[PDB]
């Protein structure tokens, strides 16, 4: 539950580490052997799939923060320039999934949305400032080894974990690469994908794009001269950027995949909605409703 957030049933709770977890620790190299991008079963139990009912379509990612609340990006529900404006009945959330190409009856949970709450000051016409939304489930979902909530950070966790160079993890079923024409389509995985990336200094984030960035965002990604690569992409929006705290061994959702220009382009970085910066709103919503 709330108290049990961030501790994974199939990992921390069993004293097992996932394959790249150690890459997020200050002490690390990375050579020759590079681990796969396929997620290990149950490695992101807070992972949520935002699904359009008809025509069937995997819209975005999201995350489970309580037995009744799901967090996502606002632009996945509302973005006028693409004539996007979904309402509760237009979709559902799929929780506890691993493969997206089949229904996983033993671990998967499908929840009907009771109400969507988009940040009233979500700035879609300009720079996606405050790109964040909450979705209250009609019924609380039960936890299991595959469905467990992630923790949200507080002021200090954010101040200590969000430092240039520190790495976080992004997960999702979105596109595997930027394509040459928007039309080429979607190159999608069948299994949840994972990538770990470093937070980059604000001045670099700011200088990397002409879009006006705000304090409600942060960017992550490797720099041209860093050699490693990786990034979030189309379809990943709403997914979590998590960080494991060395202080208590719990996973914290520091961000939400929000935007970027292209995918994995050199000198370009993925931008994420800064979760702590928008926590009073999250809290007001959860405390006022349900």
């Amino acid at each position: 539950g709330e108290a049990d957030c961030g501790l994974r049933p199939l990992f921390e709770k069993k004293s097992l580490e996932d394959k790249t977890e150690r890459e997020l620790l200050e002490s690390y190299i990375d050579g020759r052997i590079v681990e796969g991008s396929d997620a290990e079963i149950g490695m992101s139990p807070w992972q949520v799939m935002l699904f359009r009912k008809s025509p069937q379509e995997l819209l975005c990612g999201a995350s489970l923060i309580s037995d009744r609340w799901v967090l996502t990006a606002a632009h996945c529900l509302l973005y006028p320039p693409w004539d996007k404006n979904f309402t509760e009945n237009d979709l559902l959330v799929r929780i506890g999934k691993h493969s997206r190409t089949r229904y996983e009856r033993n671990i998967e949970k499908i929840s009907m949305l009771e109400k969507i709450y988009i940040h009233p000051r979500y700035n879609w016409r300009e720079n996606l400032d405050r790109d964040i939304a909450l979705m209250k489930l009609k019924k609380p979902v039960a936890f299991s080894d595959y469905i467990h909530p992630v923790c949200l950070p507080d002021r200090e966790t954010a101040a200590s974990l969000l430092q240039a160079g520190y790495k976080g993890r992004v997960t999702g079923w979105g596109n595997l690469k930027e394509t040459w024409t928007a039309n080429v389509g979607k190159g999608q995985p069948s299994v949840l994908q994972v990538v770990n990336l470093p937070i980059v200094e604000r001045p670099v984030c700011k200088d990397s794009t002409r879009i006006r960035i705000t304090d409600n965002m942060f960017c992550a990604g490797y720099k041209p001269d860093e050699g490693k690569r990786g990034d979030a992409c189309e379809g990943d929006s709403g997914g979590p950027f998590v960080m494991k705290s060395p202080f208590n061994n719990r996973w914290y959702q520091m961000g939400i995949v929000s935007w970027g220009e292209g995918c994995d382009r050199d000198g370009k970085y993925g931008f994420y909605t800064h979760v702590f910066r928008l926590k009073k709103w999250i809290q007001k919503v959860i405390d006022q409703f349900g």
């Binding site: 008809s54 499908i110 019924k139």
Partner: peptide
């Protein structure tokens, strides 16, 4: 009602678009 609605939604999901 909620259980019924999810049932319908889940049956539609595994079958695919009508």
């Amino acid at each position: 009602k909620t259980e019924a609605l999810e049932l319908k939604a889940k049956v539609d999901l595994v079958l695919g678009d009508e």
